[PDB]
Design a protein around this motif. Sequence first.
Motif, PDB file in Angstrom:
ATOM      1  N   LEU B 678       0.818  -1.209   0.000  1.00 53.56           N
ATOM      2  CA  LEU B 678       0.000   0.000   0.000  1.00 53.56           C
ATOM      3  C   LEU B 678       0.852   1.260   0.000  1.00 53.56           C
ATOM      4  O   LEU B 678       0.465   2.265  -0.603  1.00 53.56           O
ATOM      5  N   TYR B 679       2.015   1.230   0.646  1.00 52.53           N
ATOM      6  CA  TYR B 679       2.885   2.396   0.581  1.00 52.53           C
ATOM      7  C   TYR B 679       3.592   2.491  -0.763  1.00 52.53           C
ATOM      8  O   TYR B 679       3.721   3.583  -1.319  1.00 52.53           O
ATOM      9  N   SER B 680       4.056   1.366  -1.302  1.00 58.22           N
ATOM     10  CA  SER B 680       4.775   1.396  -2.567  1.00 58.22           C
ATOM     11  C   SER B 680       3.868   1.601  -3.769  1.00 58.22           C
ATOM     12  O   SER B 680       4.374   1.857  -4.864  1.00 58.22           O
ATOM     13  N   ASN B 681       2.554   1.475  -3.607  1.00 56.78           N
ATOM     14  CA  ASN B 681       1.618   1.927  -4.622  1.00 56.78           C
ATOM     15  C   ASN B 681       1.274   3.397  -4.470  1.00 56.78           C
ATOM     16  O   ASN B 681       0.570   3.944  -5.322  1.00 56.78           O
ATOM     17  N   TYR B 682       1.730   4.038  -3.399  1.00 53.43           N
ATOM     18  CA  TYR B 682       1.558   5.472  -3.240  1.00 53.43           C
ATOM     19  C   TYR B 682       2.741   6.246  -3.795  1.00 53.43           C
ATOM     20  O   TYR B 682       2.555   7.345  -4.324  1.00 53.43           O
ATOM     21  N   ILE B 683       3.950   5.688  -3.702  1.00 50.37           N
ATOM     22  CA  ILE B 683       5.122   6.331  -4.289  1.00 50.37           C
ATOM     23  C   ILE B 683       5.062   6.259  -5.810  1.00 50.37           C
ATOM     24  O   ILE B 683       5.472   7.197  -6.504  1.00 50.37           O
ATOM     25  N   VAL B 684       4.521   5.166  -6.352  1.00 53.08           N
ATOM     26  CA  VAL B 684       4.400   5.027  -7.800  1.00 53.08           C
ATOM     27  C   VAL B 684       3.366   6.003  -8.352  1.00 53.08           C
ATOM     28  O   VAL B 684       3.607   6.674  -9.361  1.00 53.08           O
ATOM     29  N   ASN B 685       2.224   6.140  -7.680  1.00 49.09           N
ATOM     30  CA  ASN B 685       1.214   7.087  -8.135  1.00 49.09           C
ATOM     31  C   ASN B 685       1.604   8.535  -7.877  1.00 49.09           C
ATOM     32  O   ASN B 685       1.066   9.428  -8.534  1.00 49.09           O
ATOM     33  N   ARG B 686       2.512   8.796  -6.940  1.00 50.74           N
ATOM     34  CA  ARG B 686       2.935  10.172  -6.708  1.00 50.74           C
ATOM     35  C   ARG B 686       3.909  10.652  -7.771  1.00 50.74           C
ATOM     36  O   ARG B 686       3.907  11.838  -8.117  1.00 50.74           O
ATOM     37  N   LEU B 687       4.735   9.757  -8.309  1.00 53.69           N
ATOM     38  CA  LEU B 687       5.673  10.115  -9.361  1.00 53.69           C
ATOM     39  C   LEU B 687       5.017  10.246 -10.727  1.00 53.69           C
ATOM     40  O   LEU B 687       5.684  10.668 -11.674  1.00 53.69           O
ATOM     41  N   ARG B 688       3.745   9.892 -10.861  1.00 51.19           N
ATOM     42  CA  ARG B 688       3.079   9.914 -12.149  1.00 51.19           C
ATOM     43  C   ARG B 688       1.885  10.852 -12.198  1.00 51.19           C
ATOM     44  O   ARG B 688       1.188  10.883 -13.217  1.00 51.19           O
ATOM     45  N   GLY B 689       1.624  11.612 -11.140  1.00 49.37           N
ATOM     46  CA  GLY B 689       0.659  12.686 -11.190  1.00 49.37           C
ATOM     47  C   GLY B 689      -0.633  12.484 -10.427  1.00 49.37           C
ATOM     48  O   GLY B 689      -1.535  13.316 -10.558  1.00 49.37           O
ATOM     49  N   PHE B 690      -0.759  11.420  -9.642  1.00 43.99           N
ATOM     50  CA  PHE B 690      -1.945  11.180  -8.820  1.00 43.99           C
ATOM     51  C   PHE B 690      -1.504  11.239  -7.362  1.00 43.99           C
ATOM     52  O   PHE B 690      -1.121  10.225  -6.775  1.00 43.99           O
ATOM     53  N   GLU B 691      -1.568  12.427  -6.774  1.00 42.90           N
ATOM     54  CA  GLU B 691      -1.019  12.672  -5.446  1.00 42.90           C
ATOM     55  C   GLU B 691      -2.089  12.427  -4.392  1.00 42.90           C
ATOM     56  O   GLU B 691      -2.984  13.255  -4.206  1.00 42.90           O
ATOM     57  N   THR B 692      -1.994  11.300  -3.699  1.00 42.36           N
ATOM     58  CA  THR B 692      -2.813  11.035  -2.528  1.00 42.36           C
ATOM     59  C   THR B 692      -2.143  11.680  -1.313  1.00 42.36           C
ATOM     60  O   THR B 692      -0.941  11.951  -1.326  1.00 42.36           O
ATOM     61  N   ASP B 693      -2.941  11.973  -0.284  1.00 41.05           N
ATOM     62  CA  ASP B 693      -2.404  12.557   0.939  1.00 41.05           C
ATOM     63  C   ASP B 693      -1.467  11.581   1.633  1.00 41.05           C
ATOM     64  O   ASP B 693      -1.679  10.368   1.615  1.00 41.05           O
ATOM     65  N   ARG B 694      -0.413  12.120   2.240  1.00 40.69           N
ATOM     66  CA  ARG B 694       0.484  11.261   2.999  1.00 40.69           C
ATOM     67  C   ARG B 694      -0.134  10.860   4.331  1.00 40.69           C
ATOM     68  O   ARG B 694       0.019   9.715   4.768  1.00 40.69           O
ATOM     69  N   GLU B 695      -0.861  11.778   4.972  1.00 32.19           N
ATOM     70  CA  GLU B 695      -1.418  11.510   6.291  1.00 32.19           C
ATOM     71  C   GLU B 695      -2.588  10.539   6.249  1.00 32.19           C
ATOM     72  O   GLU B 695      -2.930   9.960   7.284  1.00 32.19           O
ATOM     73  N   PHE B 696      -3.219  10.354   5.090  1.00 32.67           N
ATOM     74  CA  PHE B 696      -4.159   9.250   4.953  1.00 32.67           C
ATOM     75  C   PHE B 696      -3.428   7.927   4.792  1.00 32.67           C
ATOM     76  O   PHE B 696      -3.916   6.892   5.253  1.00 32.67           O
ATOM     77  N   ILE B 697      -2.256   7.944   4.157  1.00 34.76           N
ATOM     78  CA  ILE B 697      -1.483   6.720   3.984  1.00 34.76           C
ATOM     79  C   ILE B 697      -0.861   6.296   5.309  1.00 34.76           C
ATOM     80  O   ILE B 697      -0.934   5.124   5.697  1.00 34.76           O
ATOM     81  N   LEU B 698      -0.274   7.249   6.041  1.00 33.21           N
ATOM     82  CA  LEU B 698       0.310   6.953   7.346  1.00 33.21           C
ATOM     83  C   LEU B 698      -0.735   6.544   8.375  1.00 33.21           C
ATOM     84  O   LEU B 698      -0.396   5.849   9.336  1.00 33.21           O
ATOM     85  N   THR B 699      -1.991   6.955   8.201  1.00 34.02           N
ATOM     86  CA  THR B 699      -3.055   6.406   9.028  1.00 34.02           C
ATOM     87  C   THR B 699      -3.369   4.969   8.635  1.00 34.02           C
ATOM     88  O   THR B 699      -3.677   4.146   9.502  1.00 34.02           O
ATOM     89  N   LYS B 700      -3.266   4.636   7.346  1.00 34.00           N
ATOM     90  CA  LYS B 700      -3.535   3.273   6.908  1.00 34.00           C
ATOM     91  C   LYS B 700      -2.414   2.307   7.253  1.00 34.00           C
ATOM     92  O   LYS B 700      -2.650   1.097   7.289  1.00 34.00           O
ATOM     93  N   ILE B 701      -1.203   2.803   7.487  1.00 34.75           N
ATOM     94  CA  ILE B 701      -0.136   1.931   7.954  1.00 34.75           C
ATOM     95  C   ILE B 701      -0.273   1.709   9.458  1.00 34.75           C
ATOM     96  O   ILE B 701       0.127   0.660   9.978  1.00 34.75           O
ATOM     97  N   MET B 702      -0.898   2.653  10.166  1.00 35.18           N
ATOM     98  CA  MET B 702      -1.172   2.472  11.589  1.00 35.18           C
ATOM     99  C   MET B 702      -2.198   1.372  11.825  1.00 35.18           C
ATOM    100  O   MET B 702      -2.049   0.565  12.748  1.00 35.18           O
ATOM    101  N   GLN B 703      -3.236   1.315  10.996  1.00 33.85           N
ATOM    102  CA  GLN B 703      -4.312   0.351  11.171  1.00 33.85           C
ATOM    103  C   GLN B 703      -4.005  -1.012  10.575  1.00 33.85           C
ATOM    104  O   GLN B 703      -4.831  -1.920  10.702  1.00 33.85           O
ATOM    105  N   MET B 704      -2.867  -1.182   9.921  1.00 36.03           N
ATOM    106  CA  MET B 704      -2.527  -2.457   9.312  1.00 36.03           C
ATOM    107  C   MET B 704      -1.306  -3.119   9.922  1.00 36.03           C
ATOM    108  O   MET B 704      -1.218  -4.345   9.895  1.00 36.03           O
ATOM    109  N   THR B 705      -0.371  -2.353  10.476  1.00 36.48           N
ATOM    110  CA  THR B 705       0.812  -2.936  11.092  1.00 36.48           C
ATOM    111  C   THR B 705       0.594  -3.337  12.545  1.00 36.48           C
ATOM    112  O   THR B 705       1.405  -4.093  13.086  1.00 36.48           O
ATOM    113  N   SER B 706      -0.463  -2.855  13.188  1.00 34.17           N
ATOM    114  CA  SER B 706      -0.723  -3.208  14.575  1.00 34.17           C
ATOM    115  C   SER B 706      -1.265  -4.628  14.682  1.00 34.17           C
ATOM    116  O   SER B 706      -2.008  -5.101  13.818  1.00 34.17           O
ATOM    117  N   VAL B 707      -0.894  -5.308  15.763  1.00 38.49           N
ATOM    118  CA  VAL B 707      -1.252  -6.706  15.979  1.00 38.49           C
ATOM    119  C   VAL B 707      -1.528  -6.925  17.464  1.00 38.49           C
ATOM    120  O   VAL B 707      -0.749  -6.490  18.319  1.00 38.49           O
TER     121      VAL B 707
END
Lengths: 49, 1053, 99, 99, 50, 27, 22, 6
Positions: B678-707
């Motif tokens: 999910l993070y490496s699909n955000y760096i690819v889309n950021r280099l090609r003109g589809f800029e998603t928010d970083r703070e939405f991505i960092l929230t999605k890494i919070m809800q997926m890496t926790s166990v």
Amino acid sequence: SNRLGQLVDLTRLLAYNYETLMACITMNMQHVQTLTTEKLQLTSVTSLC
Amino acid sequence: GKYNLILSEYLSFIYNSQSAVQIPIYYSSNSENATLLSILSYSYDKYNAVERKLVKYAKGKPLEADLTVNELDYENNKITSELFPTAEEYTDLLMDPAILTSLSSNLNAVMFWLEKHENDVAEKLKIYKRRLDLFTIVASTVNKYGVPRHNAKYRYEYEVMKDKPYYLVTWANSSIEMLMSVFSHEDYLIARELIVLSYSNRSTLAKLVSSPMSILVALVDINGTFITNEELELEFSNKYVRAIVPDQTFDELKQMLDNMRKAGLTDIPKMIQDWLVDCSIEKFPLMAKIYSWSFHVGFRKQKMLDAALDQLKTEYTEDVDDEMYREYTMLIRDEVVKMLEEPVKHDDHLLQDSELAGLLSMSSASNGESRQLKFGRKTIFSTKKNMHVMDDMANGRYTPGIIPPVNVDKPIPLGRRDVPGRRTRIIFILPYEYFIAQHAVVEKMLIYAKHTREYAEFYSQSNQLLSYGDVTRFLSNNSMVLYTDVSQWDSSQHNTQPFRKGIIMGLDMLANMTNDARVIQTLNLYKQTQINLMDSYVQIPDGNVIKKIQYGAVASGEKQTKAANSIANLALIKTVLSRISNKYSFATKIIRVDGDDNYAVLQFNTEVTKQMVQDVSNDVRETYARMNTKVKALVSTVGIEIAKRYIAGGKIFFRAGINLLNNEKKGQSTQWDQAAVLYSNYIVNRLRGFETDREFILTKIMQMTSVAITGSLRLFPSERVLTTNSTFKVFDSEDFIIEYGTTDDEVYIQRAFMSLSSQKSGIADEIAASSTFKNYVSRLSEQLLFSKNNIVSRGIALTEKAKLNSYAPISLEKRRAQISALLTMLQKPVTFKSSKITINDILRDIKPFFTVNEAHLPIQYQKFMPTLPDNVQYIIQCIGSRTYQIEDDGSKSAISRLISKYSVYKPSIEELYKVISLHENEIQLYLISLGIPKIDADTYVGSKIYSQDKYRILESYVYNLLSINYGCYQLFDFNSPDLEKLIRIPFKGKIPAVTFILHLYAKLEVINHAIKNGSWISLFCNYPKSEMIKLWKKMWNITSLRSPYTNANFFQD
Amino acid sequence: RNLPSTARYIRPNLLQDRLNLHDNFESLWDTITTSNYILARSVVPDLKELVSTEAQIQKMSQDLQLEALTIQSETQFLTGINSQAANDCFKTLIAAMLS
Amino acid sequence: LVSTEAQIQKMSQDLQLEALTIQSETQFLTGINSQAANDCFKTLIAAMLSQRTMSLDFVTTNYMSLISGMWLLTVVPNDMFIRESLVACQLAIINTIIY
Amino acid sequence: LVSTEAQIQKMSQDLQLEALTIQSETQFLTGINSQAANDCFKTLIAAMLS
Amino acid sequence: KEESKQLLEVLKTKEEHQKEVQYEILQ
Amino acid sequence: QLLEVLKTKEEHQKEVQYEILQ
Amino acid sequence: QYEILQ
RNA sequence: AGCC
């Protein structure tokens, strides 16, 4: 140069269809330089020989 | 540290109760200024967490679904009870997001963002007022039917989706992905039409919006271009080429804008309408914004019969001209003789054992059928093909000579592979003996393709300006480019009979060129796979019945389908360009084929006019149609569409459609691995003109890496666990920068992740002790060498142990044991003590000897990729784009020219590095285990050419560690004359291993300083002679940290 | 085609400059010969079929007897040798003489 | 007529355009289909029974389409072609083949 | 044939190839083995007879 | 509508796409 | 037990034969 | 059960 | 407890 028996065979035929169709010509066959020409590609002359 | 500040602010939002406490866990490098490991969380009141905060954002009117916009009856957004009447017939596979993150997690990641930015200043307020007007539409539609609670494995059952619309989950996932990418007013008008209309039109929305992009790249003038030499090296040429367009393209572009107004889009056809008045390159990123946003609508998952009906039902006639098919079959025959002339006359060792060449490389094949196997006492179901061989070699059924028929008795099963906005493609599921026969011969076809100008394997590098830069090197005002889009390439009439009989006729002129009895046999078995596929039946299941459809054509999923489809194009576009030369006179400059998308540059005598473009395009789609291959003939003078790349007006534009919050297949990963996808699909889309928010991505890494280990306790790892250079890396601190940390507590934790980097699996240790695994290892040592040695047989038996890591349950018992062993370290802050040289241990000794100063560099080069971010475009304009690509494959060395010739194995560059620095008699013990004979391995060791091969392996191994050829470092020129004025290191001879790493690390610290801050620095390293010799003995014992999910982070597609 | 006898055309007046803009007009001549320098740069052809750089430096590093891995730091002989700067120098020598 | 598959494999293995020292374009054999043998036969009689002048379009790189242009000038009278195209067809013959 | 590990070891001392510098004597040993002799001896005799 | 049809009358009128009108002054 | 673990490094075989420089 | 479609 |  190796196509000789099949290249004499063109000009004996190419100058016979022209010769036997010219008998059905009634108007004078005047020859002047026209404005628009008809394009021959020399790549299609290779495809005939 | 910014991720630790959002992590503490997130847990104070999702747990609003008073009973929730957070205990931060710290640690230090000393025994007695400390970085924190994780954050505990005890919360007990957890019922109805998301359904209570959604009501304050549910205003306005809900979306009423339109039920008469799709042709099928199960693609509308109807209620599931109106569609599926009983719970016994309920197919989840039509709306499944296939990501391990539910809808109730994606709604909290937006409602957390909308609280942090509720009262901002007047510039960031307009972004908040644009992301709130869209979330009113999403919340008021979900809140009418409620929020569906997911399963334990993140699917959706029947009893939670009974009274809701069928695509409520997979629409609210993609619409959250779109409203978190709104930044401008132009991005708000596109997102409002792709959210409202996507609730009802689940069939033809991604096709209508992404349609006019093949036309609009032919109207933009060229003023200055990048070109490429004959060898692939970059050049900048500033010619001026005018774009010529006939009057029937604008009568077709007007038809594409009136189809977009029947569907309801009324503000996307106003941007294309207002761009066509200028036709300028300075407003063209608006036209590639609409093409990139159209892929975020979603996938078109259908039934298998309903999506393979227009593909498998074609009209074959005998009213073609047979004079055109004799030249097409003869030009395929002339290629197969031209490719295998040198490996058959000189009898290569790779063709002499095609049975062994396919057996040791069956980990590269596609997954076969699901079959029941027995390994000792265990019974497993697997689709990998090398597990089918171990069961067939035991029961007395392994016959690689007999190739099974695929007629009406035993049809071919069918699998799918789809892309949004396109049609679907079918994939054959062949038996395991169609891979053994077609591997040693296809591998000899792909070495000729790497040295021929007209194929696609020649222009295959890591960069993107050197690969697709040969498009514009023949462009002028008297030439035109001819890119044609064949609609159904797989099942056309030019592919069934004349393509399989052009290969068979080419393998009969190679059975008279040789004298061995083996090379005639491997050329007869590759011929046998073509006669059986001449009349092939396919098997498609639907309902109760199973349909058997005749299909004599070419589909993907074969082994030769990447190198034999490229021959059928170069023989078909050579026949069409010979029929068009009866009306015009040209000279074909280049032809380049890549599967079924190609181009050809024709150079004319007189200047190209508007009449020679309209009448060549009417002689391509009328010559192709004489051969029963209907095409959309497109000719242009400035720009084309090469495969998924759009070269418009001198600049190169990519597509940015990668679905973040959806997936097309249910992957076999965990949550920790899918938080790095999910993070490496955000760096690819950021280099090609589809800029998603970083703070939405960092929230999605919070809800997926926790166990969690208990229902009341939660563990959230911190920034230093996820960002450090180890097996457990997820994201980086700055985006496009790979940083190697140098602190006394940062190397202390990287060595603490070295204990549990290797775990054992209980499934693979029971298979490896079974009787049918020892029978498979024993019959490979018979064919690999005629003798028996105890060294090679343990060297073989422990090589197929790593091949079982491709199996999906075995590769999950390791990764589930990685995270379950990490939890005993994030709770107990004390770790263990060990010493092992990493890349960070080397950089600890180099960094205190660098002195920095301020410096400036004026801009001298221009930009060829205008969708890159602003801090990367300052680097390219100051030091220059990459000119020539340095190879790191290692095949220029003399040991990788000996392994590839005399054996079929391929060793990793991390394996050749460890063995090249040992003694003479340690390279002997390793080279025999590869299959090299004793007399050859005594030659290479006894020649002492391994001493001059030490520096050809270390050059290609350090480029793999620092990731210079991959990542985002594959754009900047490293041999530029503008980086050498900043790097001032005095030269000290006789130690090349240390002097190489002083110049490769100083070149990275200047680049990584000018992305973070935007200013250049200059370095100076007067390194002593007494510290070069101490670092010399640590350049060979360096160890890398390899992860399976990180190897996909090096390539983009 | 051969045009008729009634075809006419208008001839331009190409007579040389009577203002002598190169004599004491040095700020008007500098922006009138930059115009002829950029236009002459988009006409001179660019080099294709150059010798590759990696097959040339490796041939050049045997004559100088350089060390391994440090062909760029041992001698400063091999700096700035690209194909981008080969085409740039051929263009800027032809276009500087024509303008 | 003879088979197109036979006259191409004889002609493309004698000329051998794929192994010359000029590698700036993909050389292959064009325009030897069987719809041009009829199209050149009809154009050459019909523009001779009506006295319509003919132009010649060719490319100087392809010498096979220029060697076989010697047969055109020795049968069809050179009073037929437009003079600016008759001159440019028999100037490219002497400058590249005969002289 | 002459045993390849006993011939290329005598050959690599007479060249005296240094393990550090890029010289034109490390290329004197590329592609010498038993198979390349049996395919050059054939293609010399068999081309002369044809 | 008259607004969409007037684009196709302007897009061919402009001079940055128009080329080679002089084989039609003779025709 | 992989083969890359069992074969000893150059620095290990340089310690079974001892000598002092001066 | 199977349905042949050729 | 296993390619759902």
